[PDB]
Amino acid sequence: YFGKLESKLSVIRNLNDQVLFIDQGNRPLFEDMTDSDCRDNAPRTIFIISMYKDSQPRGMAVTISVKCEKISTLSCENKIISFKEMNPPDNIKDTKSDIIFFQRSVPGHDNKMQFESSSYEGYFLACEKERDLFKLILAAADAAGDRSIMFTVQNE
Numbered sequence: 001y002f003g004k005l006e007s008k009l010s011v012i013r014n015l016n017d018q019v020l021f022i023d024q025g026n027r028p029l030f031e032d033m034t035d036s037d038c039r040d041n042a043p044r045t046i047f048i049i050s051m052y053k054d055s056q057p058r059g060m061a062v063t064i065s066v067k068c069e070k071i072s073t074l075s076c077e078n079k080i081i082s083f084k085e086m087n088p089p090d091n092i093k094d095t096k097s098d099i100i101f102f103q104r105s106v107p108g109h110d111n112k113m114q115f116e117s118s119s120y121e122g123y124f125l126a127c128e129k130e131r132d133l134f135k136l137i138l139a140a141a142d143a144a145g146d147r148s149i150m151f152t153v154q155n156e
Contacts, residue, residue: 059102
């Protein structure tokens with residue numbers, strides 16, 4: 001069981017310092033942005049990270065959402081990343097949820113974060129280059145040094 005506690009606004013960057021944003025097709029991408037780009041493309045660049053209490057504690061449980069047109073919440077349902085148009089719910093009945101990730105400090109890096117799927121243990125949010133685009137994906141990662149699953153989370 002997960003219960004919603006408190007939320008914070010944040011910008012999310014991959015290790016290349018590219019900013020996560022929701023694009024016109026409702027897909028999560030990374031792009032090089034100045035701070036001003038970032039701010040002017042709010043609310044597509046400003047993510048809401050909501051903390052949840054967990055009846056089966058395995059880390060800091062969070063949802064990630066964004067207010068593009070309506071509020072959309074990040075999902076890794078069926079091991080693929082997509083947005084669901086929904087508010088982060090007040091509670092979630094199950095111990096595994098496609099919208100709950102565990103935010104973890106990256107071992108050997110105080111300031112970088114990973115987001116592990118609660119649904120699929122050992123799978124993480126990652127950045128992958130695809131052609132000319134940098135996409136957010138769900139990836140299996142076994143190694144703490146894996147740079148593709150490391151993010152910077154800056155408050156507001």
